Design an enzyme around this catalytic site. Structure first.
Site, short mmCIF file in Angstrom:
data_model
loop_
_atom_site.label_atom_id
_atom_site.label_comp_id
_atom_site.label_asym_id
_atom_site.label_seq_id
_atom_site.Cartn_x
_atom_site.Cartn_y
_atom_site.Cartn_z
N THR A 1 41.64 -70.49 -1.19
CA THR A 1 40.66 -71.60 -1.32
C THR A 1 40.50 -72.60 -2.46
O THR A 1 40.69 -72.31 -3.61
CB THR A 1 39.24 -70.91 -1.44
OG1 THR A 1 39.05 -70.11 -0.37
CG2 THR A 1 38.01 -71.80 -1.38
C1 LIG Z 1 41.28 -69.35 -0.25
C2 LIG Z 1 41.62 -69.68 1.19
C3 LIG Z 1 42.15 -68.15 -0.55
O1 LIG Z 1 41.80 -67.62 -1.80
C4 LIG Z 1 39.74 -68.96 -0.30
O2 LIG Z 1 39.44 -68.22 -1.42
C5 LIG Z 1 39.15 -68.22 0.93
C6 LIG Z 1 37.59 -68.22 0.94
C7 LIG Z 1 36.99 -68.15 2.19
C8 LIG Z 1 35.62 -68.11 2.24
C9 LIG Z 1 34.96 -68.04 3.45
C10 LIG Z 1 35.69 -67.98 4.62
C11 LIG Z 1 37.07 -68.01 4.60
C12 LIG Z 1 37.71 -68.09 3.38
N1 LIG Z 1 39.46 -66.82 0.87
C13 LIG Z 1 40.28 -66.18 1.68
O3 LIG Z 1 40.91 -66.68 2.60
C14 LIG Z 1 40.39 -64.73 1.37
C15 LIG Z 1 41.33 -64.49 0.22
C16 LIG Z 1 41.42 -63.01 -0.02
C17 LIG Z 1 42.09 -62.15 0.70
N2 LIG Z 1 41.92 -60.97 0.15
C18 LIG Z 1 41.15 -61.13 -0.90
C19 LIG Z 1 40.83 -62.40 -1.00
C20 LIG Z 1 40.08 -62.85 -1.98
C21 LIG Z 1 39.57 -62.00 -2.93
C22 LIG Z 1 39.88 -60.67 -2.82
C23 LIG Z 1 40.69 -60.27 -1.78
N3 LIG Z 1 40.97 -64.10 2.51
C24 LIG Z 1 40.32 -63.20 3.19
O4 LIG Z 1 39.20 -62.76 2.95
C25 LIG Z 1 41.12 -62.70 4.30
C26 LIG Z 1 41.07 -61.18 4.19
N4 LIG Z 1 40.50 -63.03 5.56
C27 LIG Z 1 41.26 -63.17 6.63
O5 LIG Z 1 42.48 -63.12 6.58
C28 LIG Z 1 40.64 -63.44 7.77
C29 LIG Z 1 39.48 -64.06 7.94
C30 LIG Z 1 38.51 -64.52 6.88
C31 LIG Z 1 39.19 -64.10 9.21
C32 LIG Z 1 40.17 -63.49 9.88
C33 LIG Z 1 41.15 -63.14 9.00
C34 LIG Z 1 40.10 -63.35 11.19
C35 LIG Z 1 39.01 -63.82 11.88
C36 LIG Z 1 37.99 -64.44 11.19
C37 LIG Z 1 38.10 -64.55 9.82
#
Ligand SMILES: *[C@@]([C])([C][O])[C@](*)(=O)[C]([C]C1=[C][C]=[C][C]=[C]1)[N]C(=O)[C]([C]C1=[C][N]C2=C1[C]=[C][C]=[C]2)[N]C(=O)[C]([C])[N]C(=O)C1=C([C])C2=C([C]1)[C]=[C][C]=[C]2
Ligand SMILES: [Mg+2]
Ligand SMILES: [Mg+2]
Lengths: 222, 231, 244, 240, 195, 235, 211, 233
Positions: free
Chosen positions: G1
């Site tokens: 993000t």
């Molecule tokens: C950037 C895209 C990546 O850093 C941003 O920080 C986003 C923030 C965000 C906030 C609200 C909603 C969606 C995104 N973060 C992520 O994408 C995080 C990054 C991350 C993964 N592991 C982790 C992270 C950050 C800190 C510690 C550990 N990604 C996630 O949380 C991953 C795990 N989520 C998913 O892949 C999925 C989501 C969300 C989702 C999925 C998969 C399926 C259906 C609905 C939502």
């Protein structure tokens, strides 16, 4: 050391139509390189015209579904047999998942049904509770194989109208249930070929205003 | 007299007055009738209103797909006991994948009520319950008293003027037991039974409350224009 | 059950009084008189032991005057056993304060704490209150020399001169008459003993029927000294003031 | 633990323990609260039965809960300390969690809630205390004056009195206090507060305590001589 | 956070604290005030682990403000410093200790003396004419050892403090974005807006 | 003495019956439900003219779609309101929707009988809970300290309740407008109140689907009072 | 993000991307990283998606309860502090949540940065996430207090675009918000794919990229 | 968290037209030591269910006691305990599955793999698996440990899918099970020649066979095998 988690394989797929929704999943259950069952249902009718599948670690998936089904039952008791809307179910499931933020349900959950305007709805979750409403979602072992295909064939991504040369996109025409089921069957047939944890059988649950209907299709058993 | 201050005190003749006073609350409550055949079990309840602007207090509560009850007395106590039954029915399903036997449901209610009659500080439940259900051994009807006594019956009635309906069922015993595969006729017998307990007032559309459970019939409650058929 | 035997120690009367507090005060009115007098250069604590015996070991005896710390002392009127429970709590509180802030506890803060404990027994717990009234004599660098009193209600007030226990009505009138603001310790000592000598229920006031103490800046330079008087020293001050 | 229900309903629908707590308030020394156009004044009676008192160290009747709010009371003195302590703890707890000082209305609502809790909790008796809570909200120049009582009800007052002979001073305030035009200055507000206490107090010497609270955490307590000048001026005008 | 300095001169205590706040590889803020007024004549600066610092400072602030209201009296800097030390000594053996180092600068109105106390996260208290936490002392103490007198004016104290910051700005690898300087004296606490 | 949870020989809980007597001493509160909305009105009853009447808060918001009026020992209502507000917002958290008026009322009534030797006595206050939801529309409930709640088309509680209820018996019909209901509450309040009704000693409120729960201004109520006087003088 | 938010003359702009990642796999192309707490309060999301959604929706519950008890909207300062206090309870338990609380209250427009450590910072400009460095570059060189609503919206939009381009874990689309004293105003979802080519042509930027 | 000490190896089972068959050897191993040779790992519950357990024996004995207590408890205040309200295989399984998943969720598992075989009231065949993780599945053939790798392939040649169940007789199914047990004896180093076999039929009820031996073994060809490559003598 004891590992409380496991991987039972499988793959699931939810697609939302204009006035319907589908939730599909293969019927194969596995550990490592062995097959446990060729037919072990993974997608369930939870009541109130809602279907659900929790894919990943089957023990956690069965527990979550069991808990949500229970949540629906108690929603009727506590609120005068009111119908649980798909958006309300999704929010409820978020709280079921986050209750175990520090010992997660190891599953990718998807629910499907109709919204309060009668339109098709699919909601998608991560193992700890983040959810959102989506038009198209594949979850599980072969999710990365299938999702790009759906971006291309459902949302017409990277597709433009001939003659214009990249100036005008392909318009987003809706899909019929017959057209969607084709994409589902082709998605799983393709995933069965290239993923070892996918195969044996395919069970599709279709949701309309008339109710929940099932369709079963065989897959390759190798 | 001197032995009715709390539930922990026997009288000189071996009576528990607080339990008897709780039993009195049931007699003040509105009439409700229960009866069954071999295929179906039926609850019929006369609902009571505060006045003409008020709604009619609900009498019947669903506990599971195959079990439910009607109340007479303190309504909040029925809510507590029915909530307990809902949990017990649900524990049986989630743990044993087993629908709770109606007889066992009665045993659990008996034991829950009993604890309140032997300990200091608490009080007995001020409500009577008629539990109906359909399980693996067919249709069932139970009568619960807050003394702890639970009784399996072919038919019964509790509440104010309940003796009239109870006498009718005692005459009709041989007839209504044989009403198999006919829900409407079994309800008719219940509506005719509860009618024997009426004075001045009669069965209107928002007054009458009916519930039924059976072989291929989940526990369902009928209110409003759904019971106009039986008036 | 048990309710039958509950006296209900923490309830209001129809007039808005606390029964047990009022009855505790009645108990205290039969206790030996204790007097506190605050002067410009010190504080006096004087108290009367109750009908003693010739076989009582006086020099090792302590029923009235107790030391809370180096700067603060108390005179007791009521049940001695109840007072010792509270005294030991107050001693701990003063040490807790010293450990926390590295400064000696201000007199009022100690008094408020003990008074809050007494208050608690009148509002919750269902227990009888402490049948004790204290006179607190103390010094700190904020307000200097201070006299306080607390009673079973948990209410406390500050004083220039005050009595607790028996004959407080008579004792307070005598103190109100002869007390002046520019008074000194040696004069206050005389006033305290003269007041006890007139209010006492005994035939004559003697050394063996008294406990006496002073808190003086009469210590070498800017510091405070507590003096718990010995039997022979009480005998000498009785002769000096012209009572015996 | 001691769980005994001390505050309970009687056949006529009264909670006697709460009503007997009001009798304890009736016994307490008179307290008065008057709000002017740009200030609030809290007056308090000191019974002159207790002389030889050390007025430096004796607990003052008016207590600061925060830098912008004050609390006076009538009833059991020991009971009042418990409410004051709880109020002071809540005032700091509010600043710590919300980054704003409490409003006068919020602080009152909390103290009133504590009093109410002690009317339906097991093993405890009601507070024999009624309070007057006054002050100015942060960044606000509108005066605030509230009253609480053992039952736990609270309300806002243009002017109010509590304690012994409060019936008399309330009678005085009801005819002397005009809502359309309240005490415009501090002098007029204090004068009216002293006048009201002079109906009940006895002598105007050390028996009257006055505490003026102005906006922006401006709180001061008047001395004996300052109050004595008001007492002198009032009676000299009265001789006519 | 990074750097907090303190110096006690003739009639006042001066505290200098860095303005930088960093998360990851980005400096989120260059105007952060790493201090809380505990009482009108007592100021506490702080430095340590993210989040813990402010939480601890505000918790101390609330406790001292509560004491002030209860007694209608300002605690001496010595009394406040002892209270703070005990809280840190209590904290170090907790399940999760508060990783906070503090300087407490106060003017004792009773003794008419400025006072500076240095307390680390273990609960290690020392009264000093000048003090620092972390690596700050490694660069600055040699200058302070040389130039410091106890009869210095506030203006001379600020000049010596400028020299310390200049040395830090030259020899420290980290950019701490300058300092906010505050003076504690008989009249209370004020901020030097130009430094 | 005797147990707090003791049954009388007639089969009633002594304490619950005694709390009902306390509610009869409380100031009058009236509710009228219509198809255009539900109106809630209360008697303020200031004990003195120096008491600032606008601080008397006997009508209270629970949610945007649910309001509440009280009568009896009003201090007891604060914890019930707090629980109601918490229950309403918590359900919105768990289910992403407004909570049913009946379900909210049931949650409040579950507290009622949680007393013994839990709180030491029943609540000494009755509540009129008015609101709107999509399933059952505009609703008015009467929540008692017995744990029982009845739905009402119109209801009065407090000191002038039985007199007001008899008046509501005749006046209420299923085709009432919102304006008609407002005047009707004011009419019946003016009838049972000791002091003369005006905008300062009486308060109105309503709940509509569009605007939600609103407490009426003193200027707005004053006009409705003036409109009432003229229409009564019209015949 | 990548998220950003900044105060200016006409309120506060808030801009976020919409990507979500699970390693190198792009799990979501269009995620809402803004929560509409109330008509005058916004919350941005960065870090663990689950943590961000749960705690900010729990904040909205607590902010709603504030309004009911006090009959007044909560301040931005108080709202940010409630959230930072929640973070302090689960201190060291492994939460990952970086958020900006944007809004308009009595003090005017308000902006606070809050993270999982319990950090709470007031300021005129913030940016969080894996691509915040790229956004800061554009913001710092173009930000003024005297910005027009049109120019300010574009700045936040262009700043996310910069990050979406360079940062692999940022992209998808841009969600814009403008907070005024009458409340927040949503200024749409903007696909980065289309926006990039549009900005390239109109602005003349991204000269190195071929199109 | 623990480690298994004394262990039991494979449990194998399959459905046939009128019921189910289940089998398991009588060995209790202590690592590589074949310590205990008289261990029964098939435990009947009533006359309609047999629970087959592999893994830790101490945890097996614990489960054996839970089941014995379950029967006792079901009979309490139950006049139909030997009829309509008797214990069903589905009840027994769900109870165990509930226990297993709870124990893994407390990080203190029962180190077992369980197969519950039986026939329901309506004559339906019941065959379901559960293990230390609380993972559950059902299939026409089920097997634990080594049986999963070696027995299932053989049993799936008889019943490859649901539609093959009515075509499979008890003689064919028993023959397939017995052959599979021989194959496990050839190839599982923690197996024994002695085993137990249980048949639950909807007509003939529960048949429990003890002290069965693997027979008709092929070893003669070993005489011809010499060396590891180049050796001739
Ligand atoms: C950037 C895209 C990546 O850093 C941003 O920080 C986003 C923030 C965000 C906030 C609200 C909603 C969606 C995104 N973060 C992520 O994408 C995080 C990054 C991350 C993964 N592991 C982790 C992270 C950050 C800190 C510690 C550990 N990604 C996630 O949380 C991953 C795990 N989520 C998913 O892949 C999925 C989501 C969300 C989702 C999925 C998969 C399926 C259906 C609905 C939502
Ligand atoms: Mg294969
Ligand atoms: Mg140090």
């Amino acid at each position: 050391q004891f590992n409380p988690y496991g991987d039972n394989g499988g793959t699931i797929l939810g697609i939302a139509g204009e006035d319907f929704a589908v939730l599909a999943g293969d019927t194969r259950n596995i550990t490592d390189y062995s097959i446990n069952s060729r037919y072990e249902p993974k997608v369930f009718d939870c009541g109130d015209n809602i279907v659900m599948s929790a894919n990943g670690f089957a023990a956690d998936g069965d527990a979550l579904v069991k808990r949500f089904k229970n949540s629906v039952k108690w929603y009727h008791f506590d609120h005068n047999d009111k119908k649980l809307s798909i958006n309300s179910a999704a929010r409820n499931i978020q709280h079921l998942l986050y209750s175990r933020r520090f010992f997660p349900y190891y599953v990718y959950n998807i629910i499907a049904g109709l919204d309060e305007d009668g339109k098709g709805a699919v909601y998608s979750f991560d193992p700890v509770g983040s959810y959102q409403r989506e038009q198209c979602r594949a979850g599980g072992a072969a999710a990365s194989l299938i999702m790009p295909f759906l971006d291309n064939q459902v949302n017409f991504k990277n597709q433009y109208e001939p003659g214009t040369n990249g100036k005008v996109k392909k318009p987003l025409k809706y899909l019929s249930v017959e057209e969607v089921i084709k994409l589902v069957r082709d998605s799983f047939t393709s995933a069965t070929e290239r993923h070892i944890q996918v195969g044996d059988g395919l069970e599709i649950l279709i949701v309309t205003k008339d109710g929940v209907r099932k369709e079963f299709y065989e897959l390759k058993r190798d | 007299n001197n032995y009715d201050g709390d539930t922990v005190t026997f009288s000189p003749t071996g009576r528990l007055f607080q339990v008897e006073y709780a039993l009195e609350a049931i007699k003040q409550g509105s009439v409700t009738v229960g009866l069954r055949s071999n295929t179906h079990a039926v609850l019929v309840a006369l609902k009571r209103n505060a006045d003409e602007l008020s709604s009619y207090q609900k009498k019947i509560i669903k506990c599971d797909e195959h079990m439910g009850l009607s109340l007479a007395g303190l309504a909040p106590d029925a809510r507590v006991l029915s909530n307990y039954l809902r949990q017990q029915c649900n524990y049986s399903s989630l743990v044993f994948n087993r629908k709770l036997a109606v007889e066992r449901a009665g045993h659990l209610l008996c034991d829950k009520a009993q604890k309140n009659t032997q300990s200091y500080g608490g009080r007995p439940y001020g409500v009577g319950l008629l539990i109906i259900g359909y399980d693996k051994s067919g249709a069932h009807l139970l009568e619960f008293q807050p003394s702890g006594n639970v009784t399996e019956l072919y038919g019964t009635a509790i509440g104010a003027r309940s003796q009239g309906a109870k006498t009718y069922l005692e005459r009709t015993l041989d007839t209504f037991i044989k009403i198999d595969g006919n829900p409407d006729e079994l309800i008719k017998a219940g509506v005719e039974a509860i009618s024997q307990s009426l004075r001045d007032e009669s069965l209107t559309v928002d007054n009458l409350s009916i519930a039924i459970v059976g072989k291929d019939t989940p526990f369902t409650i009928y209110d409003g224009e759904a019971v106009a058929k039986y008036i | 059950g048990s309710r039958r035997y509950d006296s209900r120690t923490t309830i209001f009367s129809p007039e808005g009084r606390l029964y047990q507090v009022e009855y505790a005060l009645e108990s205290i009115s039969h206790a030996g008189t204790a007097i506190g007098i605050m002067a410009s250069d010190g504080i006096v604590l004087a108290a009367e032991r109750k009908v003693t015996s010739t076989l009582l070991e006086q020099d090792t005896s302590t029923e009235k005057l107790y030391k809370l710390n180096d700067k603060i002392a108390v005179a007791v009127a009521g049940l001695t056993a109840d007072a010792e429970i509270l005294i030991n709590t107050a001693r701990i509180h003063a040490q807790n304060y010293l450990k926390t802030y590295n400064e000696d506890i201000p007199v009022e803060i100690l008094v408020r704490r003990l008074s809050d404990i007494k208050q608690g027994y009148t509002q919750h717990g269902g227990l009888r209150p402490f049948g004790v009234s204290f006179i607190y004599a103390g010094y700190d660098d904020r307000y200097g020399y201070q006299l306080y009193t607390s009673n079973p209600s948990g209410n406390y007030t500050g004083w220039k001169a005050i009595s607790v226990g028996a004959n407080t009505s008579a004792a307070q009138t005598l103190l109100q008459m002869d007390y002046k603001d520019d008074m000194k310790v040696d004069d206050a000592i005389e006033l305290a003993l003269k007041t006890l000598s007139k209010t006492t229920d005994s035939s004559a006031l003697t050394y063996d029927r008294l406990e006496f103490a002073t808190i003086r800046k009469g210590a070498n330079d800017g510091e405070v000294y507590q003096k718990i008087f010995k039997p022979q020293e009480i005998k000498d001050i009785l002769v000096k003031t012209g009572i015996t | 633990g001691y769980d005994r229900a001390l505050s309970i309903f009687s056949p006529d629908g009264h909670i006697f323990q709460v009503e007997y707590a009001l009798e304890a308030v009736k016994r307490g020394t008179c307290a008065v609260g008057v709000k002017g156009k740009n200030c609030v004044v809290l007056g308090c009676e000191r019974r002159s039965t207790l002389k030889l008192q050390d007025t430096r160290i004796t607990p003052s009747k008016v207590s600061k809960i925060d830098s912008h709010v004050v609390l006076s009371f009538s009833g059991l003195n020991a009971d009042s300390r418990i409410l004051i302590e709880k109020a002071r703890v809540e005032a700091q707890s509010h600043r710590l969690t919300l980054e704003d000082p409490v409003t006068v209305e919020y602080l009152t609502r909390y103290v009133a809630g504590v009093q109410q809790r002690y009317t339906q909790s097991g093993g405890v008796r009601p507070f024999g205390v009624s309070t007057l809570i006054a002050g100015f909200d942060p960044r606000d120049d509108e005066p605030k004056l509230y009253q609480t009582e053992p039952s736990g009800i609270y309300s806002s007052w243009s002017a109010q009195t509590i304690g012994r002979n409060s019936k008399t001073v309330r009678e005085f305030l009801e005819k002397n206090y005009d809502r359309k035009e309240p005490p415009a200055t501090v002098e007029e507000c204090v004068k009216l507060t002293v006048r009201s206490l002079l109906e009940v107090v006895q002598t105007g010497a050390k028996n009257i305590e006055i505490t003026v609270v102005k906006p922006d955490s401006d709180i001061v307590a008047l001395s004996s001589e300052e109050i004595n000048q008001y007492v002198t001026q009032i009676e000299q005008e009265k001789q006519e | 956070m990074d750097i907090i300095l303190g110096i006690r001169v003739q009639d006042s205590v001066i505290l200098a604290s860095s303005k930088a706040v960093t998360r990851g590889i980005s400096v989120l803020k260059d105007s952060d005030d790493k201090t809380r007024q505990l009482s009108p004549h007592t100021l506490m600066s702080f430095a340590g682990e993210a989040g813990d610092t402010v939480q601890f400072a505000e918790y101390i602030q609330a406790n001292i403000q509560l004491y002030s209201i209860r007694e209608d009296y300002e605690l001496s800097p010595q009394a406040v410093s002892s209270f703070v030390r005990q809280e840190l000594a209590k904290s170090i053996r907790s399940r999760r200790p508060y990783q906070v180092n503090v300087l407490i600068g106060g003017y004792d109105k009773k003794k008419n003396k400025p006072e500076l106390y240095q307390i680390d996260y273990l609960g290690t208290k020392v009264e000093l004419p000048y003090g620092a936490h972390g690596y700050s002392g490694f660069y600055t103490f040699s200058l302070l050892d040389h130039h410091y007198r106890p009869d210095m004016t506030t203006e001379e104290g600020l000049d010596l403090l400028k020299l310390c910051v200049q040395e830090l700005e030259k020899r420290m690898p980290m950019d701490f974005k300058g300092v906010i300087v505050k003076i504690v004296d008989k009249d209370g606490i004020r901020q030097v807006d130009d430094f | 003495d005797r147990g707090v949870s003791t049954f009388s020989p007639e089969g009633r809980l002594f304490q619950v019956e005694y709390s009902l007597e306390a509610i009869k001493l409380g100031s009058t509160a009236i509710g009228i439900a219509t198809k255009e909305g539900v109106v809630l009105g209360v008697e303020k009853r200031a004990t003195s003219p120096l008491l600032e009447s606008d601080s008397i808060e006997k009508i209270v918001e629970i949610d945007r779609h649910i309001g509440c009026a009280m009568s009896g020992l009003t201090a007891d209502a604060r914890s019930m309101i707090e629980h109601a507000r918490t229950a309403a917002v918590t359900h919105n958290l768990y289910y992403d929707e407004d909570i049913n008026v009946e379900s909210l009322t049931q949650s409040v009534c579950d507290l009622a009988l949680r007393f013994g030797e839990l709180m030491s006595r029943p609540f000494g206050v009755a509540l009129l809970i008015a609101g709107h939801d999509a399933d059952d529309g505009y609703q008015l409930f009467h929540a008692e300290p017995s744990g029982t709640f009845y739905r009402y088309n119109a209801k009065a509680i407090g000191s002038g309740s039985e007199g007001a209820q008899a008046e509501l018996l005749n006046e209420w019909h299923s085709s009432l407008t919102l304006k008609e209901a407002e005047l009707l509450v004011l009419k019946i309040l003016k009838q049972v109140m000791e002091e003369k009704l005006d905008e300062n000693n009486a308060q109105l409120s309503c709940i509509t689907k569009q605007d939600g729960f609103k407490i009426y201004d003193n200027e707005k109520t004053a006009e409705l009072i003036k409109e009432l006087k003229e229409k009564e003088a019209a015949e | 993000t990548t998220t950003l938010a900044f105060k200016f003359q006409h309120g506060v702009i808030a801009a976020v991307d919409s990507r979500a990642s699970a390693g190198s796999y792009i799990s979501a192309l269009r995620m809402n990283k803004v929560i509409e707490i109330n008509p005058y309060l916004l919350g941005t999301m960065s870090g663990c998606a689950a943590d961000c959604q749960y705690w900010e929706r729990l904040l909205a519950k607590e902010c709603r309860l504030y309004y009911l008890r006090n009959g007044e909207r909560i301040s931005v300062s108080a709202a940010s502090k409630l959230l930072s206090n929640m973070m302090c309870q689960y201190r060291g338990m492994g939460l990952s949540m970086g958020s900006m609380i944007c809004g308009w209250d009595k003090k005017g427009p308000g902006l606070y940065y809050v993270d999982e450590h319990g950090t709470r910072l007031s300021g005129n400009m913030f940016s969080t996430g894996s691509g915040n460095t790229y956004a800061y570059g554009v913001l710092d060189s173009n930000y003024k207090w005297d910005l027009s609503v049109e120019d300010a919206l574009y700045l936040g939009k262009r700043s996310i675009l910069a990050a979406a381009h360079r940062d692999a874990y940022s992209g998808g689309s841009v969600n814009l918000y403008h907070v005024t004293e009458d409340g927040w105003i949503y200024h749409g979802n903007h696909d980065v794919g289309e926006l990039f080519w549009k900005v390239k042509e109109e602005e003349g930027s991204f000269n190195n990229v071929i199109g | 968290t623990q480690q298994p000490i004394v262990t039991g190896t494979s449990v194998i089972s399959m459905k046939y037209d009128n019921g189910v068959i289940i089998a398991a050897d009588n060995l209790g191993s202590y690592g590589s030591l074949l310590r205990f040779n008289g261990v029964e790992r098939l435990i009947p519950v009533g006359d309609n269910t047999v629970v087959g357990i592999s893994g830790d024996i101490s945890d097996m004995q614990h489960i054996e006691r839970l089941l014995k207590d379950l029967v006792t408890e079901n009979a309490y205040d139950n006049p139909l305990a030997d009829a309509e309200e008797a214990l069903e295989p589905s009840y027994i399984f769900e109870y165990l599955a509930t226990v297993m998943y709870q124990r893994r969720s407390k990080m203190n598992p029962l180190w077992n793999a369980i197969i519950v075989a039986g026939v329901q009231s309506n004559g339906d065949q019941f065959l379901r698996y559960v293990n230390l993780l609380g993972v559950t599945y059902s299939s026409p053939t089920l097997a634990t440990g080594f049986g999963a790798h070696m027995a299932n392939p053989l049993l799936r040649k008889v019943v490859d899918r649901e539609s093959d169940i009515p075509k499979t007789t008890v003689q064919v199914a028993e023959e397939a099970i017995v052959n599979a047990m021989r194959v496990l004896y050839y190839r599982d180093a923690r197996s024994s020649r002695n085993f137990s076999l249980a048949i639950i039929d909807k007509n003939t009820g529960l048949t429990f066979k003890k002290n069965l031996q693997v027979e008709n073994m092929k070893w003669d060809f070993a005489k011809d095998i010499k060396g590891y490559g180049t050796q001739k003598i």
